[PDB]
């Protein structure tokens with residue numbers, strides 16, 4: 114038998130020690146090699162309580178990935194309150210690799226297999242593993258990228274779906290490819306391009322899922338305010354920080370390429386902590402990186418002026434990013 | 449969304465105040481107290497969980513959709529407006545105010561038809577007066593051609609009289625001159641503890 | 657000791673916009689959601705929106721979207737509220753609040769002193785005074801009731817005495833009431849000997865100083 118326990122995990126990855134890319138460098142020294150043959154045993158007649166929103170694994174991933182960024186990125190200036198540190202601004206190689214999280218001697222990880230698991234509740238189908246699946250530690254806003262997909266239909270998750278102050282995590286079943294690049298003219302203007310029909314279709318199937326919680330006209334709309342990191346789809350492509358206007362993604366009511374304008378910014382707000390950093394201008398040549406959109410982060414509007422409900426793309430607390438990826442897992446001590 | 453009641457309680461220190469909230473929605477419910485010229489204070493949350501520094505005298509409870517805040521041994525600090533809250537929504541507020549205990553007094557009721565002066569401007573105001581009653585709890589319904597009214601009436605109450613400790617109340621039925629011409633019989637029905645039966649004062653239009 | 661400290665009260669006029677501030681102390685500013693609530697006498701408390709200082713994320717009450725703006729200075733642990741296109745209906749005391757713990761927003765254990773904002777109009781309007789006359793039938797055995805209906809004036813308040821102060825005993829002047837029109841209404845009654853109606857003149861004296869208006873309405877019975 115076991116009891117719910119909280120302990121330190123360790124990370125494993127298949128990083129290359131010769132590679133100069135920052136994710137590889139970090140995992141080479143902060144993680145152990147992966148086991149090529151991950152063990153997973155199913156457990157019979159067993160049931161367990163899961164709650165991602167109270168899951169210490171999330172806090173641990175967050176602290177690691179703050180650690181990776183702090184040891185990897187190299188801003189020319191680092192502003193915090195008053196007086197800022199200057200440093201060398203070498204350009205960096207940046208492309209995340211899968212990290213797995215593993216249980217140390219004495220403990221284990223339980224995985225919820227229930228097809229329709231929401232993040233909280235009883236799991237009836239439960240197996241046991243020694244390491245999570247490989248998770249790419251992608252930091253982004255509004256859209257979750259390169260993540261995992263819902264098996265049969267789009268899934269909606271929330272710590273409390275009725276609480277308008279709780280982020281809504283959407284998980285897609287079919288990924289929508291988003292393709293961003295800055296051609297080889299203003300050297301900071303880039304563009305992202307998603308297939309319109311494919312995206313419109315997706316938004317309609319998210320509407321379907323959002324009803325069930327609200328049987329009314331579902332509206333998607335632009336963010337109402339916040340830092341530019343929040344009001345735009347923000348993400349790091351090959352060392353450069355992209356900010357893409359998603360107005361054309363979130364502007365529709367439910368009852369050709371889409372082409373998103375982006376700027377590459379040298380001055381950003383840190384997500385790790387309160388502060389801003391400055392980076393060199395964009396490396397020249399073709400800067401590209403296309404990704405699978407696998408999820409969306411949403412906030413519902415409060416007030417009651419139903420008819421309709423309005424949703425805007427959210428984010429900012431990266432812990433939601435980790436939650437979308439770790440919700441099936443749980444640590445336990447082995448008494 | 450959240451309907452709170454009653455609107456006003458009239459009590460003395462030592463008595464018990466029972467305030468209620470009706471909600472159809474799912475959500476943890478909380479109660480706040482607001483003294484005159486002060487910031488509201490959290491009293492109950494999660495339905496029945498006492499906030500810090502809050503005596504046992506304060507007690508929340510729930511029966512189906514109806515939540516209740518009970519304040520037992522009333523003290524001068526307790527008087528003011530109380531609100532229920534569920535997520536971002538609030539009750540209208542219940543005003544619990546100091547009252548002076550007195551013998552029961554039945555209201556004398558008077559109704560006043562629209563003055564001709566006014567009718568000559570397209571609006572009709574019928575007024576009902578409940579004078580010098582106690583306790584404050586009183587009910588006034590309007591009937592036009594015997595049909596119950598809703599929305600088109602406003603009420604207003606005086607403070608407890610410094611001499612006789614009675615309350616007086618006014619109800620005013622505001623109608624367009626149009627509607628006023630369509631119906632004949634105007635009446636206000638009054639109920640109050642001091643009345644053996646509900647009282648009705650009425651009149652026929654254009655017919656004093 | 658979580659303490660929220662707000663800026664001083666303000667006077668405004670229709671059309672203007674306001675900015676109030678709120679400084680948070682005794683906790684991780686970026687770790688807790690913040691809220692703006694306004695309270696006005698007789699009105700249901702209204703939640704205006706929340707602000708997450710983290711990235712400045714927000715969520716505005718739907719009836720306010722367009723008019724309200726919530727920002728913050730993460731280096732000064734200060735939240736800011738801006739409301740534009742002020743009307744008289746924006747008169748209220750504005751509060752910032754935080755939950756009892758960061759895991760739940762809505763249990764507002766912490767409030768600031770509140771910033772009172774008053775929005776005053778240059779517009780005025782004198783009342784129309786209508787007699788509330790004794791009729792029915794001597795009103796009763798021996799007691800009669802009569803009054804004035806002081807209607808559609810603005811802004812507040814109005815004075816109402818009887819026979820220029822001579823008559824005070826038995827007089828009840830009711831609290832003014834606001835109407836959908838945006839204009840106020842008020843009633844004033846008095847009881848008197850039903851026998852004296854034929855011989856005793858009753859006049860009500862209404863003064864609405866904002867429009868420098870004086871009306872003296874004689875209320876006489878219904879001699880049919």
Ligand SMILES: *[C@@H]1O[C@H](CO)[C@@H](O)[C@H](O)[C@H]1NC(C)=O
Nearest residue numbers: 155156157158159160237238
């Ligand atoms: C588990 O329990 C169920 C009945 O609740 C039973 O049908 C099943 O065979 C059990 N599994 C075993 C035998 O371990």
Ligand SMILES: *[C@@H]1O[C@H](CO)[C@@H](O)[C@H](O)[C@H]1NC(C)=O
Nearest residue numbers: 231233234235269270271274
């Ligand atoms: C799972 O999530 C839903 C919201 O999607 C929630 O209402 C429900 O309580 C959860 N189911 C449980 C507790 O098993």
Ligand SMILES: *[C@@H]1O[C@H](CO)[C@@H](O)[C@H](O)[C@H]1NC(C)=O
Nearest residue numbers: 155158226227228237238239
């Ligand atoms: C557990 O889930 C897997 C698929 O995720 C399925 O093959 C298996 O039948 C499930 N077992 C139970 C407990 O129903």
Ligand SMILES: *[C@@H]1O[C@H](CO)[C@@H](O)[C@H](O)[C@H]1NC(C)=O
Nearest residue numbers: 258259260288290403404405
């Ligand atoms: C995008 O989606 C496909 C599955 O449709 C997957 O095989 C591919 O590896 C994904 N690409 C990325 C960048 O994850």
Ligand SMILES: *[C@@H]1O[C@H](CO)[C@@H](O)[C@H](O)[C@H]1NC(C)=O
Nearest residue numbers: 164166233234272273475476
């Ligand atoms: C959501 O909120 C309810 C109270 O309204 C609480 O009982 C529940 O635990 C919350 N959801 C979870 C399990 O995280």
Ligand SMILES: *[C@@H]1O[C@H](CO)[C@@H](O)[C@H](O)[C@H]1NC(C)=O
Nearest residue numbers: 309310311312313314317318
């Ligand atoms: C998106 O889908 C809906 C039906 O699913 C349709 O009404 C609408 O025309 C589509 N939008 C575009 C631009 O294709």
Ligand SMILES: *[C@@H]1O[C@H](CO)[C@@H](O)[C@H](O)[C@H]1NC(C)=O
Nearest residue numbers: 324325326327328329330419
């Ligand atoms: C939602 O409401 C619509 C009409 O308002 C109705 O057509 C539909 O059946 C409802 N969905 C469910 C299953 O509640």
Ligand SMILES: *[C@@H]1O[C@H](CO)[C@@H](O)[C@H](O)[C@H]1NC(C)=O
Nearest residue numbers: 341344345357358359360361
């Ligand atoms: C995004 O672009 C739209 C126009 O399509 C504009 O209205 C909005 O202000 C822009 N917002 C951001 C975050 O740049």
Ligand SMILES: *[C@@H]1O[C@H](CO)[C@@H](O)[C@H](O)[C@H]1NC(C)=O
Nearest residue numbers: 334335360361363364365366
């Ligand atoms: C918002 O969406 C509507 C259609 O849903 C469209 O007519 C309008 O052009 C869009 N606005 C923007 C910002 O492009």
Ligand SMILES: *[C@@H]1O[C@H](CO)[C@@H](O)[C@H](O)[C@H]1NC(C)=O
Nearest residue numbers: 308309310311312369370371
């Ligand atoms: C988008 O995808 C659909 C297939 O799902 C296809 O018909 C269409 O050609 C695509 N649009 C573009 C412009 O590539």
Ligand SMILES: *[C@@H]1O[C@H](CO)[C@@H](O)[C@H](O)[C@H]1NC(C)=O
Nearest residue numbers: 251258259348402403404405
């Ligand atoms: C998603 O995965 C692809 C394939 O490795 C990669 O090129 C791209 O940079 C990833 N997207 C992000 C935002 O990291």
Ligand SMILES: *[C@@H]1O[C@H](CO)[C@@H](O)[C@H](O)[C@H]1NC(C)=O
Nearest residue numbers: 330332366367368420421422
């Ligand atoms: C919901 O409200 C919006 C305005 O915010 C309106 O344009 C839309 O038509 C409404 N939806 C429905 C289907 O009533």
Ligand code: NA
Nearest residue numbers: 132133134206
């Ligand atoms: Na490399």
Ligand code: NA
Nearest residue numbers: 187188200201
């Ligand atoms: Na550096």
Ligand code: NA
Nearest residue numbers: 476534535762
């Ligand atoms: Na609540």
